From a paper:
E. histolytica is the causative agent of amoebiasis, a disease mainly characterized by dysentery that leads to about 100 000 deaths per year. A similar EhCRT construct was then produced and beautiful crystals were obtained. The first evidence is now provided of a complex conformational transition with the junction reoriented towards P-domain closure.
Calreticulin (CRT) is a 46 kDa soluble multifunctional protein that was initially identified as an endoplasmic reticulum (ER) chaperone for monoglycosylated proteins and is also involved in Ca2+ regulation. Similar to its ER membrane homologue calnexin (CNX) ectodomain, CRT is composed of a globular domain, into which a flexible arm-like P (proline-rich) domain is inserted. The globular domain is made up of seven concave and six convex β-sheets forming a legume lectin fold. We have investigated the CRTs of two distinct parasites, Trypanosoma cruzi (TcCRT) and Entamoeba histolytica (EhCRT), for which a pathogenic role has been proposed.
Residue numbers in the entry: 14 to 206, 289 to 360
Write the structure that this text describes.
């Protein structure tokens, strides 16, 4: 069992803010949160409204998912009552950027995954790099938009198939087939899955020769989004063992949140 990355955010020593994006950035903070299931646990929070948040970290080791499972599993919370804001992550190959601080919204990524909320639109992104900066998308499931943590899980299997789960419950599965349309570079994934259908099937869409970095690059209107925990592994049993710990801690979190609301406004 090979764990390629497990960030619990005791600190963000590994994560480097971008110097290359040209955008107005805000600072991340390591915080407990307004409600939590473990008083010694902490998370990565966006601290300032109407700013971008752009940083990247190196994985524990460079790897390829050829002929292997890949599990991307992370716990994300919109504690602020989100009106418009991203909450997703990106995985990047070694050649995308010379070092962490070169990461920008335009850098080449292998995979973009996670929730994204704005103006009524609420989607879980699953974007797969196809060729160059062209990506594939399909019609996407809703994401959660309340104020407690939710575990997002993406499983990529080497028969070119995938599974999407929220809080340990399957919400979508399939093969990377003509359900998916091709997105042009820089074009928005609006969640409908409707773009350019004119591209040849790749039986190796699932596979990337290099995973080396992970990056966060989100716009925030109301800031306060918390990235609690990030796991990258090739081992389904290890992913399930860590999910159990996190889901039990999210249950205690929710009970603290319900007890606070029951006493307040
Ligand atoms: Ca944590």
């Amino acid at each position: 069992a090979k764990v390629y990355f497990h960030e619990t955010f005791e600190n963000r020593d590994k994560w480097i803010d971008s110097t290359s994006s040209g955008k107005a950035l805000g600072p991340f903070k390591i915080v407990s949160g307004k409600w939590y299931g473990d008083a010694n646990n902490k998370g990565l929070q966006t601290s300032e409204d109407n700013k971008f948040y752009i940083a990247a970290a190196k994985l524990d080791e460079e790897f390829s998912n050829k002929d292997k499972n890949l599990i991307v599993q992370y716990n994300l919370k919109f504690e602020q009552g989100i009106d418009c804001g991203g909450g997703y992550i990106k995985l990047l190959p070694k050649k995308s950027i010379e070092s962490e601080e070169k990461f920008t919204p335009e850098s080449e990524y292998n995979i973009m995954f996670g929730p994204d909320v704005c103006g009524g639109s609420k989607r879980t992104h699953v974007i797969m790099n196809y060729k160059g900066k062209n990506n594939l998308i399909r019609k996407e499931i809703k994401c959660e938009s309340d104020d407690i943590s939710h575990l997002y899980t993406l499983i990529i299997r080497p028969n070119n198939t995938y599974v999407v789960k929220i809080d340990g419950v399957e919400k979508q599965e399939g093969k990377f087939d003509e359900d998916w349309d091709m997105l042009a570079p820089k074009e928005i994934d609006d969640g409908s899955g409707i773009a350019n259908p004119d591209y040849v099937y790749d039986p190796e869409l699932y596979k990337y020769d290099s995973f080396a970095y992970i990056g966060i690059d989100v716009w925030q209107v109301k800031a306060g989004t918390i990235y609690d925990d990030i796991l990258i592994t090739d081992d389904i049993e290890e992913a399930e063992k860590e999910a159990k710990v996190i889901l039990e801690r999210n249950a205690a979190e929710k009970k603290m949140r319900d007890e606070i609301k029951e006493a307040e406004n």
